[PDB]
């Protein structure tokens, strides 16, 4: 299934300068931000 961690996606997104990250979508595995 999906393989996103507790907050390691959220830290990756904040490191790209995003407002927050969120493990959501369709078909794919990888976590995304906003």
Q: What one-character-per-residue DSSP string does 1-34 give?
A: -----SSHHHHHHHHTT-S-EE---SS----EE-
Distance separating alpha carbons of residues 34 and 32, to the nearest angstrom: 7
Tell me the technique behind this structure. Answer: NMR
Q: How far is CA 16 from CA 1, 12, 26, 32, in A?
A: 25, 6, 22, 11
């Amino acid at each position: 299934g999906s393989a996103c961690q507790f907050w390691s996606c959220n830290s990756s997104c904040i490191s790209r300068g995003y407002r927050q990250g969120k493990c959501w979508g369709i078909q794919y595995k990888y976590c995304q931000c906003q």
